[PDB]
Design a protein around this ligand. Sequence first.
Ligand SMILES: O[C@@H]1[C@@H](O)[C@H](O[C@@H]2CO[C@@H](O)[C@H](O)[C@H]2O)OC[C@H]1O
Length: 324
Amino acid sequence: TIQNDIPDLYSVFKDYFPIGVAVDPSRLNDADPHAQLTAKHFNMLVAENAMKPESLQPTEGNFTFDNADKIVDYAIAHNMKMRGHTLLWHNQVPDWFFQDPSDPSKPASRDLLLQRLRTHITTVLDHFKTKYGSQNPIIGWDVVNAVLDDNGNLRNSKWLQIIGPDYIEKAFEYAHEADPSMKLFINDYNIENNGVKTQAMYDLVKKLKNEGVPINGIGMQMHISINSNIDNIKASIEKLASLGVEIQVTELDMNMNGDVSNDALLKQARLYKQLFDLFKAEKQYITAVVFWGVSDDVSWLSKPNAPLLFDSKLQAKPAYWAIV
Ligand SMILES: O[C@@H]1[C@@H](O)[C@H](O[C@@H]2CO[C@@H](O)[C@H](O)[C@H]2O)OC[C@H]1O
């Protein structure tokens, strides 16, 4: 059961940015304590999985929006904004996209994969616009997700193999044509470490924006660890922000590296407090901070872990009190 009278987390950040959370459609019932935590603490929602490509078009032309729409309906009922995650990724994308349908042993061509990408993006955005209209809570989408490799080169996914390097710009062109009201993000992890991947993200967005690609923001997943360096996160935000794009912290959680001891929870609280002081100091660039999961027991990280502000019994952790 949850603590009903402690401060609503997002309210602490009302003069800075919305505070959101990634959710599962099965955790939205009024009587479910995970749903109660969700509605109490967050004013922004993201689908952890229900808006991924496999979750929306499992076989070609067969769109499955029920779970996504359940999350959208809940966001509307709770006066929450949403982020759309995600139109393109190398995981949770059905194999049919990349196969020649007359010979599935062969790859789809560049033109066929681009047409499929355009149809998927346009159908997904037109679905939310036609079903929800002005009540659509989605303010923007992760148009492409994790397109860089660990060394900063373009990840050699099937999108890159079949189409080539301009598949990224094409995804943004298709999204922008389908719904110009959406803010369009490129989203990625490890770009907060101020290493070669941060520099490659800055170089890629600088290039594409100079070419007129409609990229409005960079999503910094921020799957950080208890050993992450705040100075490096601050230098990465400053570098990426110099491109004149919005920054959103999209999938925040903290990998404890197997140490869930009380001492580690106190170290986590100090690090989360430093991180949120940094986000508040960079409020001129940051337009949303979203946590990747409601509470530790539903985190995607393998066990043992304690990555979030609410523990495995849904109680506020030292980190929650340090930030509020
Ligand atoms: O439920 C799990 C999700 O939490 C997980 O979400 C991904 C985490 O890695 C990030 O790079 C991705 O952007 C994000 O979608 O996906 C796997 C799923 O089983």
